[PDB]
Design an enzyme around this catalytic site. Structure first.
Site, short mmCIF file in Angstrom:
data_model
loop_
_atom_site.label_atom_id
_atom_site.label_comp_id
_atom_site.label_asym_id
_atom_site.label_seq_id
_atom_site.Cartn_x
_atom_site.Cartn_y
_atom_site.Cartn_z
N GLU A 185 0.93 -1.33 0.17
CA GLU A 185 -0.10 0.07 0.26
C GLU A 185 0.91 1.25 -0.04
O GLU A 185 0.41 2.49 -0.39
CB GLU A 185 -0.89 -0.22 1.08
N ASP A 213 -11.00 -7.43 -3.01
CA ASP A 213 -11.97 -8.40 -2.88
C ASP A 213 -13.41 -8.17 -2.44
O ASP A 213 -13.52 -6.99 -2.15
CB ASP A 213 -11.64 -9.53 -1.80
N1 LIG Z 1 -12.45 -8.62 3.34
C1 LIG Z 1 -11.73 -7.51 3.93
N2 LIG Z 1 -11.90 -7.66 5.31
C2 LIG Z 1 -11.19 -6.78 6.08
N3 LIG Z 1 -10.11 -5.93 5.68
C3 LIG Z 1 -10.05 -6.27 4.34
N4 LIG Z 1 -8.98 -5.62 3.86
C4 LIG Z 1 -9.16 -6.06 2.18
N5 LIG Z 1 -10.11 -6.84 2.00
C5 LIG Z 1 -10.65 -7.22 3.40
#
Ligand SMILES: Nc1ncnc2[nH]cnc12
Ligand SMILES: Nc1ncnc2[nH]cnc12
Lengths: 227, 228
Positions: free
Chosen positions: A18, A195
Site C-alpha cells: 500500500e 475482494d
Molecule cells: N474482506 C476484508 N476484510 C477486512 N479487511 C479487508 N481488507 C481487504 N479486504 C478485506
C-alpha cells in the site's frame, strides 16, 4: 493565501504493498523507525509529505497515527490501501472514497451507545469535506473498520444488518479517524477493492492486493498535485 | 529481590477516572499534561518516579495513550490497572486477577492461518513481564482477554468461552497496551479487579462496583510500587 491549503501531508498505509509506489516517488526520503512503524519524510509530487507504514489492524494504525501527529504535526492525514467490497455494484479494483468511517465490531450498546460507537467517542468520524472534494476531482460513502478479515457468511450478514449503508470494510480506517478526532486533525480514507463479500475473498485478496494498493496510491498522487 | 531487574521510572495506565483517581491523589504535586485526548500526571508515588496515564476506553484510545506515554516519557515499564468482567468459576466482585498474558478475544484473521485472537504480524499472545508478575504476586494469575465489546449477552460469552477456555476475565484495553509495549519492547503488566461477573446483571453491577474495582486494582499497584 485564502485557499484551503494543507502544507504538510501525512499519508498512511498498512502494508508494504500500500506504500511502496508512494515511497518510490519520493525525492530522497529520510526513514525513521519508531514504535514498530516506519516514517518517510520528503517531497512527493511537489508536496511536503510524511509517509507512514503502520502495520495491520486498529492497534498498529493507532500507534502509527499518534506518532505521526505528535512527532510530525501534518496538516491532514490521508489513509490509502485496499478494502473488501459490500455494496452491490462494487467490483475488484473499484475505488471508494470515505465520507465517514465507523467501527463495525465495536459494541457497547448495553450502555446506550449506538452500534459501532466506542464509549467517549462519536458514533462516526466524518472525513474532511475538502479532502473528499479533491479526491472526487481526481463511489462516496461509509466504510467500516474491524479487527477481522470479513469472509464468512454469518459475519458478512451481521455487518450488513448492522450497517445497511456500509460500502466496504477494512482493518484500519476508523482507528485512524478516531486518533485524528482525538488530535483534531483533518483526514480522509481512500480504498480500492481487493475482494468482494461472498466471492473467494482469501485468494482474491492475495491476487489483487498489489494492484489495488497501487490503484489507491495513484488517487493519492493525483490528490497531492491539487492540494 | 536482589536478583531482580530494577524499574526506575514506572508508567501506569487506567482507562477511567474511577481507575486513576486514588492513584493520582497519592502523588506529590503532580504535573499534568493534556495531549491527544489523554492525560498524563508526572510525579512521585509511593517512593517511585511515575507517569500516571488516563487513557480513555477501548483499544484505540489505550493505544494512543500508551504510544504517547512511551515516546514522550520513556518509562522502564508499564502497568495497566482497572476493572474487568469475571469468567472464571470462583471469581467474585472485587477479586483481583493478575495477567500472565493478554490476548485479543475479538481479533479474527484465521482465514489466513493465524490463531484465533492473533493479529497479523503480531504474536498470538503478549506475555506480561516475569518480574512484574512476581511482584504483583508478592503483594488468581492467568489469561485476560481484550475486545472492543462490553461482554454481557449469552451468545457472546459462550463464544468467548469456546475460543478461550483458559480466559479468567475480559476487558477493553489490556492486550492493546500489551501490543504497543511489544512494538516498543517495554516490559508490561495488567492487573484488574472484577466489577461484574459473566451473566450476572452486568450493566447494573459495573455501574455499582466500578469504583470498588478501580480501588482494589489501584491498591495492588500502590503495594507493587512499594517493592520496586
Ligand atoms: N474482506 C476484508 N476484510 C477486512 N479487511 C479487508 N481488507 C481487504 N479486504 C478485506
Ligand atoms: N463485562 C465487561 N466486558 C468488557 N470490559 C469490561 N470491563 C469490565 N467489565 C467488562
Amino acid at each position: 493565501a485564502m485557499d484551503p491549503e494543507f502544507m504538510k501531508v501525512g499519508i498512511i498505509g498498512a502494508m508494504e504493498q500500500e506504500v511502496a509506489l508512494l515511497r518510490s516517488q519520493m525525492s530522497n526520503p529520510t526513514t525513521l523507525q519508531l514504535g514498530g512503524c516506519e516514517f518517510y519524510q520528503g517531497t512527493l509530487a511537489g508536496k511536503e509529505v510524511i509517509l507512514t507504514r503502520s502495520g495491520i489492524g486498529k492497534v498498529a494504525a493507532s500507534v502509527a497515527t499518534s506518532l505521526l501527529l505528535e512527532k510530525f504535526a501534518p496538516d491532514c492525514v490521508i489513509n490509502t490501501g485496499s478494502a473488501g467490497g459490500f455494496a452491490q455494484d462494487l467490483h475488484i479494483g473499484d475505488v471508494v472514497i470515505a465520507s465517514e468511517m465507523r467501527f463495525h465490531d465495536v459494541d457497547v450498546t448495553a450502555f446506550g451507545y449506538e452500534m459501532g460507537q466506542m464509549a467517549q467517542q462519536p458514533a462516526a468520524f466524518p472525513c474532511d469535506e475538502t479532502l473528499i472534494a479533491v479526491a472526487q476531482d481526481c463511489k462516496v460513502g461509509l466504510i467500516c473498520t474491524g479487527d477481522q478479515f470479513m469472509c464468512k457468511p454469518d459475519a458478512i450478514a451481521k455487518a450488513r444488518a448492522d450497517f445497511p449503508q456500509m460500502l466496504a470494510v477494512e482493518m484500519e480506517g476508523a482507528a485512524i479517524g478516531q486518533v485524528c478526532h482525538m488530535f483534531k486533525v483533518p483526514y480522509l480514507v481512500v480504498r480500492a477493492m481487493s475482494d468482494i463479500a461472498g466471492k473467494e475473498q482469501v485468494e482474491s485478496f492475495d491476487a489483487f492486493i498489489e494492484v489495488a494498493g497501487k490503484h489507491s496510491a495513484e488517487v493519492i498522487i493525483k490528490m497531492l498535485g491539487k492540494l
